[PDB]
Amino acid sequence: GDDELDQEILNLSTQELQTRAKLLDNEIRIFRSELQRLSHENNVMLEKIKDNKEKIKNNRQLPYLVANVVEVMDMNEIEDKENSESTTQGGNVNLDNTAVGKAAVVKTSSRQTVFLPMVGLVDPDKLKPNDLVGVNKDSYLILDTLPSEFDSRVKAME
Amino acid sequence: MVLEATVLVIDNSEYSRNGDFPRTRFEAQIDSVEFIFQAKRNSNPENTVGLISGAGANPRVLSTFTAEFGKILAGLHDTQIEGKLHMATALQIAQLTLKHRQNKVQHQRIVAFVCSPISDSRDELIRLAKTLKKNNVAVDIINFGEIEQNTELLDEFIAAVNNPQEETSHLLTVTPGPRLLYENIASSPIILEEGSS
Amino acid sequence: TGRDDTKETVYISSIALLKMLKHGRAGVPMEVMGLMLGEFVDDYTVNVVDVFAMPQSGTGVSVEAVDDVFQAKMMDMLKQTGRDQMVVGWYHSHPGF
Amino acid sequence: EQEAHNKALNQFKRKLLEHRRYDDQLKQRRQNIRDLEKLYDKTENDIKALQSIGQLIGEVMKELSEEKYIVKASSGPRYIVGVRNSVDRSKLKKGVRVTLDITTLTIMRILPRETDPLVYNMTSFEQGEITFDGIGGLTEQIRELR
Amino acid sequence: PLQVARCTKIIKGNGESDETTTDNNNSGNSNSNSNQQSTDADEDDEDAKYVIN
Amino acid sequence: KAQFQELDSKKQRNNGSKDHGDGILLIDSEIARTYLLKNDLVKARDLLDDLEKTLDKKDSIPLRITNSFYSTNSQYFKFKNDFNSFYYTSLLYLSTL
Amino acid sequence: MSLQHEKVTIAPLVLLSALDHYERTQTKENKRCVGVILGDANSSTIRVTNSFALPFEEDEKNSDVWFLDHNYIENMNEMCKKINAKEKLIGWYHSGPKLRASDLKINELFKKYTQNNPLLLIVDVKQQGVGLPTDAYVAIEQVKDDGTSTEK
Question: Per UniProt, which keywords does this protein have (chain D)?
Answer without folding.
Answer: Acetylation, ATP-binding, Nucleotide-binding, Proteasome
